[PDB]
Predict the structure of Spike glycoprotein.
Amino acid sequence: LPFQQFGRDIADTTDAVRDPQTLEILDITPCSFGGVSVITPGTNTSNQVAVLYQGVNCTEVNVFQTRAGCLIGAEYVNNSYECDIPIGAGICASYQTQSIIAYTMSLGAENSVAY
Amino acid sequence: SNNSIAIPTNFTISVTTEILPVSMTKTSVDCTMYICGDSTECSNLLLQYGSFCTQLKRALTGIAVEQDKNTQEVFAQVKQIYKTPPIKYFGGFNFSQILPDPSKPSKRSPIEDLLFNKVAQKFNGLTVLPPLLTDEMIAQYTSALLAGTITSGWTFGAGPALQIPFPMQMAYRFNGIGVTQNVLYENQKLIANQFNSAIGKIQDSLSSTPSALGKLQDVVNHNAQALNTLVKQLSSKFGAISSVLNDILSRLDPPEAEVQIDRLITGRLQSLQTYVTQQLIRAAEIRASANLAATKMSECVLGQSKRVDFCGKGYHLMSFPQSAPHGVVFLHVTYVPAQEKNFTTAPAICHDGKAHFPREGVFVSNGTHWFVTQRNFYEPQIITTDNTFVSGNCDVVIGIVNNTVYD
Amino acid sequence: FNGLTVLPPLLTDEMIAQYTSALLAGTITSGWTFGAGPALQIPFPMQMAYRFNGIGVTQNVLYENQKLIANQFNSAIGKIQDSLSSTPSALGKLQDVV
Amino acid sequence: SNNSIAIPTNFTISVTTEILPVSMTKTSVDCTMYICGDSTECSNLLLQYGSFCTQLKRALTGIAVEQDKNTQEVFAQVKQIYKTPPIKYFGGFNFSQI
Amino acid sequence: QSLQTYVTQQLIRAAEIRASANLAATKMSECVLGQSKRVDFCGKGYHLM
Ligand SMILES: *[C@@H]1O[C@H](CO)[C@@H](O)[C@H](O)[C@H]1NC(C)=O
Ligand SMILES: *[C@@H]1O[C@H](CO)[C@@H](O)[C@H](O)[C@H]1NC(C)=O
Ligand SMILES: *[C@@H]1O[C@H](CO)[C@@H](O)[C@H](O)[C@H]1NC(C)=O
Ligand SMILES: *[C@@H]1O[C@H](CO)[C@@H](O)[C@H](O)[C@H]1NC(C)=O
Ligand SMILES: *[C@@H]1O[C@H](CO)[C@@H](O)[C@H](O)[C@H]1NC(C)=O
Ligand SMILES: *[C@@H]1O[C@H](CO)[C@@H](O)[C@H](O)[C@H]1NC(C)=O
Ligand SMILES: *[C@@H]1O[C@H](CO)[C@@H](O)[C@H](O)[C@H]1NC(C)=O
Ligand SMILES: *[C@@H]1O[C@H](CO)[C@@H](O)[C@H](O)[C@H]1NC(C)=O
Ligand SMILES: *[C@@H]1O[C@H](CO)[C@@H](O)[C@H](O)[C@H]1NC(C)=O
Ligand SMILES: *[C@@H]1O[C@H](CO)[C@@H](O)[C@H](O)[C@H]1NC(C)=O
């Protein structure tokens, strides 16, 4: 409404603002940020590490996109093994042979009972 | 009275729902961004306050890993993913409501889908972490448990899965509660109809009353309340001239700026400490709930429990788990006696100078003849030597009656 | 007093006493049947015969020694009150809470 | 030894006492009354300070509701109130003390 | 500060009382409403009543 421009949301933060040129209203969103995590095997085992940018799209920034975040330094493999190092939404990384590979964790062996 | 007993001549099968919270959302808070934004001077002042930030980070990480461990312990008890055979005949028992539905892409049972349907903060350095186990994998674990408990009984829990027809498994469960398996073999159709009707009523009860799923909703609301309280207290003055850090930075002289920044820091540190303490207390409560849920899964689902009221109300027969958002729903199948009838009873039968006690069951009389029946069901039988042992004399026992023992 | 108020409990002492009396009556007259469904009347000696049969002792043991077992139980019950009276520390947990 | 076993030829009916806390005193505090009392400007300053009073009041209310829920869960197991028969004879057992 | 300390202490005591009340409810359900085979859960010895 024509009143003013200091738009705010439930979080009591300046969600939207109007400029002294057009009365255009621009929504203000925080610049992309997150926490970085280093997935590493035992130090004696190897010095290679993988970096997971959680909650950060890979476009914003070898590089693999998980729903938990952007995982760089690990190569995705279709075959499923048991979880070794937790990563996020169903993805676990392990040091397999020469490199760190990320995979969708396998719940267990498939067994069918002949009922 | 001193010589009256009541024995049920019928029974009903009641299915009850028990909902337990299992895990809570994992939250990670960035100390520097929450308390100081993007100003380096505020970070420098916070640096000398000590190691509060790393303590809070460690506490939050511990809570997150505890939630993951709780989910894994509750749901990943089984070791092999069992699959239901394509032909879904189980002697008149209908499990369509609890078995996964291949038609829907979610691969969830209708009850699970109903539960899932029934049930901003990132902007200030607060992050929610995705759970280790996705909903698909939890549903897969639940389906594996259901297939194991349907096709193998309780054998898969204690070792390799052993084949067994479902009526035979139900007969063994009936023998578990002290009722002979004949009762099931002569009332299979009635029992299956009652079970199907109860399963059908479960969905209606869940859909009609939304207060049943109140626990998980309360957990989610509490989390949202805590996060909103943190974000709202980000704007508190705490005795300062203004809540905006950049305004103070670009508006005040360096000493007064330091004073106001220190005030804001003290306020935000105490706010974060209170939030973390609340988070730890809620995490402890959720851990207790998850331990209880895991115990129920191990006892109610993977076996038959003799503990009263632990697995539903009444004599426990079996249980079925159902995945729910941040929790598990247990469907307890129980045996409830009904249609009681009173009879005249005696502790022992006096024959040819010898007492006779029932090997199993009790002695009942309908007015003119004496019979022996099992405790929980009324099936009269001729009092014979095979089901009675003498072990004593007639004078010592109080309340003994005269009758002939057939042979 | 100073802004500190104590809320009375929802269930009064009389109501908790009535619940306790109902539980005791159900246990005495119906065994464990009232907990798993409708209350089924049964003589107390036969209920204790079931209970002995549960712990692996045949009911003939109870029936042969009914009077002795009743006397022992009555003596223990009478001694419980004296034991509670002699040592006030038994309620130490509740006293510590208060 | 390889060959010896011990079989009891008698028994004792022992009654023991176990005490468990169930609920604690429900307390509510008036944050404004406790901090400032009847001072209006003190109340205004406290309102300016933040919204901790609402959070603390919610926590205390939740504690009280739990205590009530704890008592309900412990003592309301039965759905029906049972009455003992007027004649208190149970085959020689004495429940007058109970 | 004093009031928040009191509230935190009350919350911890309330959690302890929850644990005790859950134990009491379980013992009421198992020991009173039935016969328990668990060793030492309902008194010392073979539980009867
Ligand atoms: C965010 O990631 C998705 C996933 O592929 C992608 O489609 C989208 O383009 C990304 N966002 C931007 C701004 O590139
Ligand atoms: C059962 O017999 C006893 C034996 O004395 C007696 O006291 C009691 O009243 C009787 N119960 C009745 C008559 O209901
Ligand atoms: C037991 O109850 C069921 C419920 O409908 C009924 O069909 C059956 O006939 C009953 N059994 C009897 C009365 O023996
Ligand atoms: C189970 O009940 C549903 C209810 O719609 C029905 O469609 C289905 O056919 C039943 N199962 C069997 C095996 O008949
Ligand atoms: C059963 O109960 C009724 C009414 O409670 C009573 O009249 C009858 O004598 C009792 N006994 C028998 C064997 O019917
Ligand atoms: C008691 O049962 C016997 C045998 O089934 C029968 O002959 C008699 O008529 C029955 N009497 C009554 C009163 O039910
Ligand atoms: C029948 O019972 C009475 C006790 O009431 C007993 O004195 C009598 O000896 C019994 N009859 C026979 C044939 O033993
Ligand atoms: C059991 O017998 C073996 C030889 O038969 C003997 O060496 C051993 O000592 C015996 N056990 C005990 C407890 O004495
Ligand atoms: C068992 O102990 C009681 C206790 O006085 C006694 O009266 C009874 O005679 C004893 N029984 C045997 C077989 O020793
Ligand atoms: C035992 O029973 C009698 C009569 O039933 C009663 O007078 C006495 O008070 C009872 N004992 C106790 C300790 O209450």
Remarks:
- Chain D touches chain B at residues 48-51, 55, 77, 89, 91 (CB under 8 Å).
- The two ends of chain D are 46 Å apart (CA to CA).
